[PDB]
């Protein structure tokens, strides 16, 4: 029957209380329907973004980070690239769109989508073995080991986009994390008068839905 109860005479710095209007008897300029209204920060993370898969120790320029190299000369069993899915701590995905949104939260889980698009000559053909390792599993060390697991044989000739929806993507705050590896299966074959190099670009998204809980400040830009 009182409002002088303990804990109700303070500034709690997260008040939802209403407060006096500084200047009433002032008309605001009514809102205009501007294109592209945003309702969640999750909409931002559901937009595909070029991830820098290549980011070798000695990197001459910063625009070769988005290019995974593929060449004519290279053995039939050789590894193209390796990734560790952990889009919040792994260096590859750290500064992508998906990475930035995630780092403002302390708990998150869901699925992500990885599209691999071959950007190269229109006359090249070959096959690859995009292989996926479950969270607990070790990355395969040979193409033969990789093939036993979950694998998609991506034909560069008949397709040029391979979309992989990956589940069990969680915060994990070494670590249990999935792995996506890719292996030569046939090598790149070209006819006369065609370059001897091509590249593969990679994209990442936040798939159908993700859930983020509890705000936190970014550990990027320092105060």
């Amino acid at each position: 029957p009182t409002m002088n109860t303990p804990g109700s005479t303070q500034f709690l710095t997260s008040d939802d209380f209403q407060s006096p209007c500084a200047l009433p008897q002032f008309d605001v300029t009514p809102s205009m329907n501007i294109p592209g209204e945003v309702k969640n920060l999750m909409e931002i993370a559901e937009v595909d973004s070029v991830v820098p898969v290549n980011n070798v120790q000695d990197t001459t320029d910063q625009m070769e980070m988005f290019r995974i190299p593929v060449t004519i000369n290279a053995p039939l069993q050789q590894q193209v690239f390796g990734l560790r899915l952990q889009p919040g701590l792994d260096s590859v995905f750290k500064h992508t769109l998906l990475g930035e949104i995630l780092n403002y939260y302390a708990h998150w889980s869901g699925s992500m989508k990885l599209t691999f698009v071959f950007c190269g000559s229109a006359m090249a053909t070959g096959k690859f073995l995009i292989a996926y390792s479950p969270p607990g599993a070790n990355p395969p060390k040979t193409r033969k080991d990789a093939m036993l697991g979950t694998h998609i044989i991506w034909d560069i000739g008949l397709q040029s986009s391979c979309v992989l929806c990956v589940p069990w993507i969680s915060q994990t705050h070494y670590t249990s994390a999935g792995y996506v590896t890719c292996w030569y299966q046939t090598g790149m074959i070209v006819p006369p008068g065609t370059p001897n190099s091509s590249s593969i670009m990679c994209f990442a998204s936040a798939c159908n839905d993700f859930s983020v809980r509890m705000l936190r400040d970014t550990p990027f830009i320092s105060q």
Partner: protein, 241 residues
């Protein structure tokens, strides 16, 4: 008479004490996180036969570490990451009518046990190490790298007489000779890694020592038979586009 239970091995026996009135059941009874129920896991994984001698104190087996080397179940623990299972434990001893003794078969969920020396740490090989019946001892334990193992406090500091809270069945040799405890899955997270966490610990405690008269068998063999029921795991394959 004899209700012969078959699964993939046969166990002939002839009450069921359900853990808390909850039977083991799939999590599906309630894409992003698909599961893979393995329905070939159940079958009677009979453990080793301990000898109940006159001068014995008690025994305990950590679960699910007791079945870590047992067939398919053992394999799945290595392969898969997250998994949940319930268990049907049949503890049967075989004794005559000239043998007198009492046992408390109790399933204790989440029992943290203190070290023998206060303020010291001990290795994981001091609690569990495959299928072994670790032995409680009379008096104190002064071996630094061992668990406290004092029977009267049950190695937890709770008093041994009060262990009757937990789902328990008494094997009084005078009358009955079998105890069936159907333990469901009890944890605060839907499913957990089966190496890190020891879900529950089965303890068999002799409350009355065995007296066998004269020129009769000097031990009563106690056999433990565990069947993992309704075991679920995590999917290992990708979702659709």
């Amino acid at each position: 008479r004899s209700i012969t239970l078959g699964n993939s091995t046969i166990t002939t026996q002839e009450n069921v004490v359900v853990g808390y009135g909850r039977w083991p059941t799939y999590l599906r009874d309630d894409e992003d996180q698909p599961t893979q129920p393995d329905v070939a896991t159940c079958r009677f994984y009979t453990l080793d036969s301990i000898k109940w001698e006159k001068g014995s104190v008690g025994w305990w087996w950590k679960f699910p570490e007791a079945l870590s080397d047992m067939g398919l179940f053992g394999q799945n623990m290595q392969y898969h990451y997250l998994g949940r299972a319930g268990y049907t434990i049949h503890v049967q001893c075989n004794a005559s009518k000239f043998h007198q003794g009492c046992l408390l078969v109790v399933c204790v969920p989440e029992a943290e046990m203190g070290g023998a020396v206060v303020g010291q740490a001990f290795s994981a090989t001091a609690m569990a190490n495959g299928d072994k019946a670790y032995e409680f001892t009379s008096a104190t334990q002064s071996d630094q790298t061992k668990v406290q193992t004092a029977i009267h406090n049950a190695g937890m500091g709770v008093g041994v007489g009060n262990l009757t809270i937990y789902p328990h069945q008494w094997i009084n040799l005078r009358t009955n000779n079998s105890a069936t405890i159907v333990m469901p899955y009890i944890n605060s997270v839907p499913m957990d890694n089966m190496f890190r966490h020891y879900n529950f610990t089965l303890m068999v405690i002799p409350f009355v020592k065995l007296d066998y008269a004269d020129t009769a068998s000097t031990y009563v063999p106690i056999t433990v038979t565990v069947a993992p029921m309704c075991a679920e795991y995590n999917g290992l394959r990708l979702a659709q586009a």
